[PDB]
Design a protein around this ligand. Structure first.
Ligand SMILES: *Cc1ccc(S(=O)(=O)N2CCC(O)CC2)cc1
Ligand SMILES: *Cc1ccc(S(=O)(=O)N2CCC(O)CC2)cc1
Ligand SMILES: [Ca+2]
Ligand SMILES: [Ca+2]
Ligand SMILES: [Cl-]
Ligand SMILES: [Cl-]
Ligand SMILES: [Cl-]
Ligand SMILES: [Cl-]
Lengths: 9, 228, 228, 9
């Protein structure tokens, strides 16, 4: 299952 | 970073992101938060991106080490090194939680800022829960749940169902239900309802907002495909 | 890492590589070197892999920052942050060079170990040269050249032309000639002669050694394709 | 131009 990647502005 | 100007810290955080120097990015953004002013939308995203990258690398390393350790359980070095990485991960989560507690959440009065920070609070308690055992696991799980629930309550009252932060909050809370809380049915129900209510609101959006919302909806659908 | 056993440091370096924790890997291998015993073939590779990954990330960040800085030259923050990354990169190179000088090279009597360490010495002086300016650039360039040349002289006398370390040394020295020393013709000649002499020796190799050698030969050919 | 990647044991 994936959460928000959230690693790029 | 007390001697550096706030604006210089923000500028250097943006340079560190371009250079893929996420530890530096996080340190610059911590310094910016500690100047004591509220953060703009863009600055909140820089803070979040920095720490998500730092803790994401730690989590991936912890999972590699925990897998090796479990296989060896089928000298002390694997456990010792997993413990070292785990302590560093917990320290980063504690640092982010401390920024949110002193004093980002209490100064956030608009729904957009308050939801964003409460979602972060849920996420970093969730990362603590991934490595916790036993009874401290219980209290950490409840802290994550409570943060996400407060964020959900505000988001449902104050934001449209397509708002990307509302969508990402629901996505991450659904992951919490599935992976942490042992509530796969709650995870599936939340992802389904979120997806459906967003779909019904897409007609209100511009082309650019439509792209933002549908990108996160696809993540909800990807989880539903895996879970059902 | 003075209180940790040598064998535990090596074991943890291998775990850190699997976890993609290259800074930890390098620290474990530095501790292992500082125990004062010579390194085995496998341990030399762990040391090299660790530092190549650490300095590789720094070099990539420095190039991003230097590009932004040059575009701005067509406040002080870009230069300040490039300088910060540059200083950290120079510190890592100095650390590796100091391990080689105290006392890995002087204790290396077999050709395989001595060539490996002198190739490392050339590489870390080359990384210093990439960020150096002016006259200190000259002396750093000469230190890289001298290390590579000594390694080349030993390798040509003591190793077959297909030996992977001899091949990688020649590849990296050719890159030095092309990118650092402004000697593209010397770079092309060295890569061509190295490739041709290796090709003529492939018939002597087992299937596994053939794969090892041909992989590096392909890198020489890839550079020749770009340079000619 | 590429040097030895050298980043995997
Ligand atoms: C939790 C979360 C993080 C990031 C996003 S986003 O990538 O859609 N984006 C929303 C608009 C803002 O600029 C912040 C980043 C959604 C949810
Ligand atoms: C400089 C250099 C590094 C690595 C290699 S390698 O990948 O072919 N390999 C050679 C055999 C040993 O096990 C060391 C690693 C060649 C050159
Ligand atoms: Ca100021
Ligand atoms: Ca001992
Ligand atoms: Cl450890
Ligand atoms: Cl406020
Ligand atoms: Cl700086
Ligand atoms: Cl010796």
């Amino acid at each position: 299952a994936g959460s928000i990647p959230g690693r790029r502005s | 970073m007390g001697s550096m100007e706030r604006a210089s810290l923000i500028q250097k955080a943006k340079l560190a992101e371009q250079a893929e120097r996420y530890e530096d990015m996080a340190a610059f953004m911590k310094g910016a938060v500690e100047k004591g002013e509220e953060l703009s939308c863009e600055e909140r995203n820089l803070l979040s991106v920095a720490y998500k990258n730092v803790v994401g690398g730690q989590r991936a390393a912890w999972r590699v080490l925990s897998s090796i350790e479990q296989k060896s359980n089928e000298g002390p070095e694997v456990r010792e090194y997993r413990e070292k990485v785990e302590t560093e991960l917990q320290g980063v989560c504690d640092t982010v939680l401390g920024l949110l507690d002193s004093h980002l959440i209490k100064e956030a009065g608009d729904a957009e800022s308050r939801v964003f920070y409460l979602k972060m609070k849920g996420d970093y308690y969730r990362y603590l829960a991934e490595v916790a055992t036993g009874d401290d696991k219980k209290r950490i799980i409840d802290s994550a749940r409570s943060a996400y629930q407060e964020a959900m309550d505000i988001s449902k009252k104050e934001m449209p169902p397509t708002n990307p932060i509302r969508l990402g909050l629901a996505l991450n809370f659904s992951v919490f239900h599935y992976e942490i809380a042992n509530s796969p049915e709650e995870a599936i129900s939340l992802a389904k309802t979120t997806f459906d209510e967003a779909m019904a609101d897409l007609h209100t959006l511009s082309e650019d907002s439509y792209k933002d919302s549908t990108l996160i909806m696809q993540l909800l659908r990807d989880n539903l495909t895996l879970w059902t």
